[PDB]
Amino acid sequence: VVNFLLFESAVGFSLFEVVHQADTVGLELPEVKDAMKTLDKFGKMVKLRSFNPWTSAAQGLEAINLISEGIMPEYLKSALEMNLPQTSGKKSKVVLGVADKKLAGEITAAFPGVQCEAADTSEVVAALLRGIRTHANKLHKSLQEGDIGRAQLGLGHAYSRAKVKFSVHKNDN
């Protein structure tokens, strides 16, 4: 049973709040797969709760080079402090759904009241984040300034160049 879920993309990270959660026994069923296909039957499942864009491409570069290595960033901790109900897990918990297992462990260690479900382990949150990645252009378009294609393009170039150190020994042009 999922309550909220994180979703990080190149323009920023947004957390959705699930209402009418997905059936977990009939996940391999054709009617439920068609529901995950169609936006008119998956937007009933997800409702956009919060959005945090980057301030700059330097912050987006730091975001990938923290998230891919596993460690969560301070502004992700900030937005989770802002959006999640402040609890400690003694009598009531909040189930968050995240894509990566190391990020799950760190969010659970930073917030003791938030139980995280990784998409690498749990098939329900895997199918649910898969549907959000499918329809991610239309779920954000009311506050998607511009597009996502050039943002992903420039951010993949910046991430690859920071990993490779390309400009310091490419000079022949």
Among 6, 11, 22, 98, binds other proteins (CB under 8 A): 22
Whole-number minimum distance, CB 103 to other proteins, in Å?
A: 22
Taking a C-beta distance cutoff of 8 angstroms, is the pair 14, 132 a contact?
A: no
Among residues 17, 35, 136, 162, the one that binds other proteins under rule CB under 8 A: 35
Using CB under 8 A, which residues numbered 64 to 83 contact other proteins?
A: none
Q: For Cα atoms 88, 127, 91, give the angle at the middle one, nearest 5 degrees.
A: 15
Contact between 124 and other proteins per CB under 8 A? yes
Decide if residue 123 touches other proteins (CB under 8 A): yes
Using CB under 8 A as the binding rule, whether residue 44 contacts other proteins is answered as: yes
Of 39-47, 52-60, 109-117, 135-143, the window that binds other proteins (rule: CB under 8 A) is: 39-47
Q: Convert 65-102 to b/e letters by CB count within 10 Å (16 or more is b).
A: eebeeeebbebbeebbeebbeeeeeeeeebbbbbbbeb
Is 120 a binder of other proteins (CB under 8 A)? Answer: no
CA distances from 87 to 56, 101, 103, 108, 111 (A): 32, 22, 19, 12, 8
> How far apart are the C-alpha atoms of 12 and 154, rounded to whole Å?
14
Q: Does 92 bind other proteins (CB under 8 A)?
A: no
24: contact with other proteins by CB under 8 A: yes
- Which helix (H) or strand (E) element contains residue 27? none
Site residues for other proteins per CB under 8 A: 1, 20-29, 31-32, 34-35, 40-42, 44-45, 123-124
